[PDB]
Write a protein that binds this ligand. Structure first.
Ligand SMILES: [Mg+2]
Ligand SMILES: [Mg+2]
Ligand SMILES: [Mg+2]
Ligand SMILES: [Mg+2]
Ligand SMILES: [Mg+2]
Ligand SMILES: [Mg+2]
Ligand SMILES: [Mg+2]
Ligand SMILES: [Mg+2]
Ligand SMILES: [Mg+2]
Ligand SMILES: [Mg+2]
Ligand SMILES: [Mg+2]
Ligand SMILES: [Mg+2]
Length: 117
RNA sequence: GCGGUGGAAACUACCAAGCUGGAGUACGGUAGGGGCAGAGGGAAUUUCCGGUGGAGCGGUGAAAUGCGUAGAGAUCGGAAAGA
């Protein structure tokens, strides 16, 4: 739909799922792919493999718009933080910068209590 | 045991003067999340207002309630607030 030569890839990795969004430097969203939209449900939705197919599935659409260089943003403690990165590499798209944006509060809102499990 | 009387003068007690090592005062330093009061600061989060986008998000041992086509989550820009 839009052919943008350079932009950014946001990958949020949580413990139950990982979102991979494709955007451009103007701060605008083009197309996204989630581990859940790939036909995965809750348990499997956390594994690095679903993050793999998620990243691959977004980059399908990003090469279809004909884009070349990109920055990678990784947010969150989950597993896909490593796995997704591999996909970004093997999908044959030039890797500019890979940053870790995981929000670190400098103090603040008191987190939920400890699960006694 | 109590009372009277004659002696002794070390220890406690009393009376008079002394002495610093105890306790303080002045002086000069120095470390400190000590206390009270008044200024300022940033992350993060939540909600609200927009632009993109367009099906799931969220969550568990595995699920479901819940939130979502009345456009969620994601992402960029703005405000506001408290801790
Ligand atoms: Mg889990
Ligand atoms: Mg006698
Ligand atoms: Mg005497
Ligand atoms: Mg005296
Ligand atoms: Mg105060
Ligand atoms: Mg600020
Ligand atoms: Mg649209
Ligand atoms: Mg419902
Ligand atoms: Mg409404
Ligand atoms: Mg619209
Ligand atoms: Mg949102
Ligand atoms: Mg404020």
């Amino acid at each position: 739909a839009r052919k943008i030569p350079k932009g950014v890839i946001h990958v949020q990795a949580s413990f139950n799922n990982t979102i991979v969004t494709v955007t451009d430097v103007r701060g605008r969203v083009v197309s996204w792919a989630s581990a859940g939209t790939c036909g995965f449900r809750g348990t499997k939705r956390g594994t690095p493999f679903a993050a793999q197919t998620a990243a691959g599935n977004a980059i399908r659409t990003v090469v279809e718009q004909g884009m070349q260089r990109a920055e990678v943003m990784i947010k969150g403690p989950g597993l896909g933080r490593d796995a997704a990165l591999r996909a970004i590499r093997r999908s044959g798209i030039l890797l500019s910068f890979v940053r870790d944006v995981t929000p670190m509060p400098h103090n603040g809102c008191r987190p939920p209590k400890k699960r006694r499990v």
